[PDB]
């Protein structure tokens, strides 16, 4: 998670479409879904990223509605959008153990325990957030059995995207759960 900001450009597809959902949070406009092999995936935008102009126009304000609306309207050619990324959010780096363990409990996603002397334990994971993306794949929506999976396929190294669980629940809302997990990009980006 990089502090500053930086400028993306994108062309809508051939539908119309650049494969964002917005969301209003505390003033500001957040990522609430990046779609499989979108313009919005392309060019690197995540959920939970914040949206600080579009075309050059401050979003401070803006109700997810009128964001959208202003996405629909704008020529599709290029649009510029400021982003800050991910700022609800923070990346822990853990290393397995010989069990293959980094020492914690989740559900729906969820860390709800952590284990003591484990690797979790020493670099200070919390309770209580949602886990986003692991090793910078995104996976929310995915079931807890597939996260598992991905934590296994994972080498030694394992580095975990936690948002705050209070967040987490207040960026999703209105958003249907088979959504997420059909549309929610899952790839590893692409060069």
């Known amino acids: 998670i990089k502090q500053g900001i930086r400028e993306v450009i994108l062309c809508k597809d051939q539908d119309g479409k650049i494969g964002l959902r917005l969301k209003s949070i505390d003033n ?14 392309l060019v690197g935008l995540r959920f939970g990223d914040q949206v600080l102009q579009i075309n050059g ?9 009128k964001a959208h609306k202003v996405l629909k309207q704008a020529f599709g050619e290029k649009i510029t959008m400021t982003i800050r990324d991910r700022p609800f959010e ?34 200070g994971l919390l ?3 949602n886990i986003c993306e692991i090793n910078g794949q995104n996976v929310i929506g995915l079931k807890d059995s597939q996260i598992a ?12 995207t936690i948002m705050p669980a209070f967040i987490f629940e207040h960026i999703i809302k209105r958003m249907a759960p088979s959504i997420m997990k059909s549309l929610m990009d899952h790839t590893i980006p692409e060069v």
Request: with cysteine; aromatic share 6%.
């Open 28 to 41: 500001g406009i957040f990522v609430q879904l990046v779609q499989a092999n979108s313009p919005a995936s």
């Open 57 to 65: 126009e401050n979003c401070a304000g803006w109700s997810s509605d």
């Open 90 to 123: 923070r990346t822990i780096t853990m290393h397995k153990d010989s069990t293959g363990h980094v020492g914690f409990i989740f559900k729906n996603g969820k860390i709800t325990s952590i284990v003591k002397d484990s690797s979790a334990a020493r670099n």
């Open 127 to 129: 309770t209580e957030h």
């Open 149 to 160: 999976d991905i934590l296994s396929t994972s080498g030694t190294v394992v580095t975990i």
